[PDB]
């Protein structure tokens, strides 16, 4: 029940209305990722770089398996039962992730039966088929570069250069891996890691994974850019150096009786200065309730807002009074800079601050004047069918509202400052004034 | 001296205790980095790209030498003496860095004797040896790509394509360099630059630089991910296009009589609504003093917090009183979203908001009920061992503390709002109320 007419005089012009949607109900897939390439084709000059690489990789891979083994050891069938005493400290999300891990551990037993076939692959993307019912996909980290560059050039250059090239490539791959799979990964149990982060073990090519898995939908990019496609690590092999990953693919659902409203700010003139209004730009209306939303965590499109989680925030009572038509409670800030918006267009009607900008009518060739008792000017085709501002000519529509818009006044709120140091200074000054007032109150109590 | 029993009823459940570690006492080494490759074996049709590349690189390299010369001129022996009049304006860290630069300048004189040998290198990683007691390592920026790709194909394609490929590779390298070594580098004297940023001159392969130097330790990854390995530029050559870098490698020490405590927040029930408490999640206790810590700059592991600098912060008196037992001084906030934690596990004991979530005991098959005068419920195995909260079945231990936990109440604090605009609105409202009170009390002053 926002009062748009009173808000437009403050400088808040209504914009586009959008929908609200959140994800749920995912489909699951299982994949195998290898972290070591096959160099059987060029074994003449490999040196001892592979032993050093294996030693370096083992130390990275050990803590993840150590962290998984805690939940692996304390879950058994009985729903599923967990030993609370043996775990000690946990949150709800970790418990849910552990239940999901136990459920996913069923297919890993069937996958692990093909260890010999996994260790014998020599291509970047391989499909392994045991029976017609079950198939798996294997991705190898650095096989394409070795197959394309090093092997065909094995007889034209000395092999020391080939060894140096292989060592440099392995070191670069490890440097890329350490940002994601290092000690920053404190909680591998959870299932909130995105597919983009997991793709670093394949060189950042998540498009190949998603395309090979056979996923196809109309909202593929919307799901990809809102961080809704996630993954989870379920098994690590320290002898053959591979991991097993589960991939989740959700769908989007629309929330009932909810929408989001956007406002555009335009500066206005009060006494001799420019002012702006400090009001939230995005407002969520759900059923009959008005609230805030942290839109920095969500993706904004032309007709909907897509999030992976509900992000509602409470709102104060004075702000709610301001938004419903009480303009005496809305704060304002002074303008000192020379760059600020000064007009806006809504439904073919122009809202302009003609004190700070040049306004004139194309048809009559005469300027449009604003007095000192007005904050803004509304322009439509009943008085000026065609307007010119700066170097643009605009043709206007008709306003649907009060015909006496330009002859009615309003009340203004108090000025404020929005800087951190200014916030501290204001708090200090108000405390000092309050203490002085309380001291005088004590003095009056004595008398 | 935190009062955990009273804090648990508010909704703060104690978690893991960790240690506090800070770096000190580094070891130093030095290296030479070249920024131009050797194209002697493809010189027949290199074109004229090398002259343009040199002209482009000289303009980048000049200001760094200009900035170093200021401290080079005004430092001499007397310990180490500095002319304060000729410097003019400086900070303490800059002066310490200048002293370190003067100390490091001794070995560069010995290194610069091998300029002819530095010019003649044609490999990616080279070890130059003058006498058995002094050796240096040389890294070349783009030699591997030229040696592996362009040279073997010099006769199969027209070499205008090779010219274009070389130009594109050089341009890509410069585009990568400009982010770090451009005009963003305003103070090259300091020694706070990390090895990750320095490795951009070698293409981002810091693993090769670290492993070739012979460094090896058990805290390698912890030191690497906490930004404790730094470097400093000490010499720039404009006629030969190479730089000399010094690298520092510290060790970790443990602060005595100090630890860090973590708290887990769980929403609780009051009146007819949900609330969550606003208290810092990490608390530092040093000797007998309680304080805050900005943990966003530090690395968190499963048993310790590693930082490169002390990050203690002062704390107000009211928050300390809240943490020591006075629950009437702790603020709270309303919950509007549908995603919030609702239970937690601590030492085998369950803390749950059983009004909002569904609570049942599997042993007796009977639901567990919470009255309207309780904020939370404590569940252990003295009532019934096995509990179900959903798709998870949990077995519980015994609680250590008061046996009348569920029959005792507390006092609650005042509500607050934490949004950015709400702070300004609240400040405005409080100021207006204070001004009105003073304006009225002026009349009482008159009386």
């Amino acid at each position, epitope marked *: 029940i926002l009062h748009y007419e009173k808000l437009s005089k403050i400088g808040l012009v209504k914009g586009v209305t959008r929908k609200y*949607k*959140i994800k*749920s*109900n995912p*489909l699951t897939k299982d994949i195998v990722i290898k972290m070591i390439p096959n160099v059987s084709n060029m074994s003449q000059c490999t040196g001892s770089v592979m032993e050093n690489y294996k030693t370096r990789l083992n130390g990275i891979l050990t803590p993840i398996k150590g962290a998984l083994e805690i939940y692996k050891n304390n879950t058994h069938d009985c729903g599923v039962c967990m030993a609370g005493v043996a775990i000690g400290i946990a949150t709800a999300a970790q418990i849910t992730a552990g239940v999901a891990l136990y459920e996913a551990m069923k297919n890993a037993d069937n996958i692990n039966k093909l260890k010999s076939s996994i260790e014998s692959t020599n291509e970047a993307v391989v499909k392994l088929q045991e029976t*017609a019912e079950k198939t798996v996909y294997v991705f190898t980290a650095l096989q394409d570069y070795i197959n394309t560059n090093l092997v065909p050039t094995i007889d034209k250059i000395p092999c020391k250069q080939t060894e140096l090239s292989l060592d440099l490539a392995l070191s670069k791959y490890l440097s890329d891996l350490l940002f994601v799979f290092g000690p920053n990964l404190q909680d591998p149990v959870s299932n909130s890691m995105t597919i983009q982060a997991i793709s670093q073990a394949f060189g950042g090519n998540y498009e190949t994974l998603l395309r090979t898995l*056979g996923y196809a939908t109309e909202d593929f990019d919307d799901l990809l850019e809102s961080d809704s496609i996630t993954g989870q690590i379920i098994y690590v092999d320290l002898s053959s150096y591979y991991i097993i990953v589960r991939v989740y693919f959700p769908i989007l*659902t629309e929330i009932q009786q909810a929408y989001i409203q956007e406002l555009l700010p335009v500066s206005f003139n009060n006494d001799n200065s420019e002012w702006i209004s400090i009001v939230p730009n995005f407002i969520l209306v759900r059923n009959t309730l008005i609230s805030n939303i942290e839109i920095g965590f969500c993706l904004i499109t032309k007709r909907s807002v897509i999030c992976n989680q509900d992000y509602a925030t409470p709102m104060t009572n004075n702000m709610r009074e301001c938004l419903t038509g009480s303009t005496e409670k809305c704060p304002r800030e002074l303008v000192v800079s020379s760059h600020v918006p000064r007009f806006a267009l809504s439904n073919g009607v122009l809202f302009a601050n003609c004190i700070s900008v040049t306004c004139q009518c194309q048809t009559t060739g005469r300027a449009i004047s604003q007095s000192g008792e007005q904050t803004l000017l509304m322009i439509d085709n009943t008085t000026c069918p065609t307007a010119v501002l700066g170097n643009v000519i605009i043709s206007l529509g008709k306003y649907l509202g009060s015909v006496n818009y330009n002859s009615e006044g309003i009340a203004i709120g108090p000025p404020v400052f929005t800087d951190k140091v200014d916030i501290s200074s204001q708090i200090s000054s108000m405390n000092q004034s309050l203490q002085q007032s309380k001291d005088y109150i004590k003095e009056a109590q004595r008398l | 001296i935190l009062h955990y029993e009273k804090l648990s009823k508010i909704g703060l459940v104690k978690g893991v205790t960790r240690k506090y570690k800070i770096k000190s006492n580094p070891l130093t080494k030095d290296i030479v980095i070249k920024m131009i490759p050797n194209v002697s074996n493809m010189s027949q049709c290199t074109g004229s790209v090398m002259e343009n590349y040199k002209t482009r690189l000289n303009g980048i390299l000049t200001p760094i030498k200009g900035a170093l010369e200021i401290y080079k001129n005004n430092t001499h022996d007397c310990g180490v003496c500095m002319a304060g009049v000729a410097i003019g304006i400086a900070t303490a860290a800059q002066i310490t860095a200048g002293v370190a630069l003067y100390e490091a300048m001794k070995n560069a004189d010995n290194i610069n004797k091998l300029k002819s040998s530095i010019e003649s290198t044609n490999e990616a990683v080279v070890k130059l040896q003058e006498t058995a007691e002094k050796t240096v390592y040389v890294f070349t920026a783009l030699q591997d790509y030229i040696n592996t790709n362009l040279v073997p194909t010099i006769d199969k394609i027209p070499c205008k394509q090779t010219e274009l490929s070389l130009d594109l590779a050089l341009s890509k390298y410069l585009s990568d360099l400009l982010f770090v070594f451009g005009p963003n580098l305003q103070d090259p004297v300091s020694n706070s630059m990390t090895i990750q940023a320095i490795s951009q001159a070698f293409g981002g392969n810091y693993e090769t630089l670290l492993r070739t130097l012979g460094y090896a330790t058990e805290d390698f990854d912890d030191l690497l991910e906490s930004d404790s390995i730094t470097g400093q530029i000490i010499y720039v050559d404009l006629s030969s296009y190479y730089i000399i870098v010094r690298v520092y490698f510290p060790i970790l020490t443990e602060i005595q009589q100090a630890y860090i405590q973590e708290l887990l927040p769980v929403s609780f029930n009051n009146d007819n609504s949900e609330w969550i408490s606003i208290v810092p999640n990490f608390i530092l206790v040093r000797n007998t003093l309680i304080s805050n810590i900005e943990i966003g700059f530090c690395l968190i592991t499963k048993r310790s917090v590693i930082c490169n600098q002390d990050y203690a912060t002062p704390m107000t008196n009211n928050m300390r009183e809240c943490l020591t037992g006075s629950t009437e001084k702790c603020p709270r906030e309303l919950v509007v979203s*549908s995603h919030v934690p609702r239970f937690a596990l601590s030492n085998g004991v369950l803390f749950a908001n059983c009004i909002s979530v569904t609570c049942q005991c599997q042993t007796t098959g009977r639901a567990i009920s919470q009255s309207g005068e309780q904020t939370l419920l404590m569940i252990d195995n003295t009532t019934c061992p096995t509990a179900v909260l959903g798709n998870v079945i949990i077995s519980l231990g015994k609680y250590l503390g008061s046996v009348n936990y569920n029959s005792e109440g507390i006092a609650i604090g005042p509500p607050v709002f934490t949004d950015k605009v709400d702070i300004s609105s609240q400040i405005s409202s409080m100021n207006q109320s204070l001004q009105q009170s003073k304006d009225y009390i002026k009349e009482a002053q008159r009386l």
Partner: antibody
Amino acid sequence: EVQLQQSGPELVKPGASVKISCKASGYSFTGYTMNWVKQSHGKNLEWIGLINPFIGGTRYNQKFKGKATLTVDKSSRTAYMELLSLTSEDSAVYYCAREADYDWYFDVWGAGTTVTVS
Amino acid sequence: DIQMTQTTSSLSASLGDRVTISCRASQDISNYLHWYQQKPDGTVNLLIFYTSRLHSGVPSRFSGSGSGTDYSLTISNLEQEDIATYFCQQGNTLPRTFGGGTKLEI
């Protein structure tokens, strides 16, 4: 044991509107997604739509977009489906079903409610 | 969008015999096929999900197989309470679609 209880048969005059309810017991109501299915003469099955009560989200089939409205009530653990502007072809059997967590299959079904329009 | 066709609508079998029911699809569905059974009194039960997995409480008499666009359900030595209707459902793309149904008889 988990089970779903539906309402009884009913007769509708053409042009009127109807509501059908479904009650659940033996599990946590807000932890699962609910689906509605239609079976007509000839034993063909058609999927109408789904509702998620934890977040209050809905999804519809494009064929039934203007015909059906889905609603949940968490106090009594009940689901409602409302049908609008009935004709003679809307006489059928309606099924209330629960969905599995991961894969799109239904594990628990209701008894069914028959609707006749005349 | 995706059409599911069961060619045979009625099948005749004797006690203790082996029966097979086939289900086809117009596109690749990547093993997202489920099987349902409808009793004469009107109750519906789930038998096989993800083309090879037995639901809890279902006897091991039933089995399922297939790939690509062709799938099959096999029942061995069938007994008296196996006379019902059988449906195949896909779960790869919205909207979800069902098959025609196949009726068994003695």
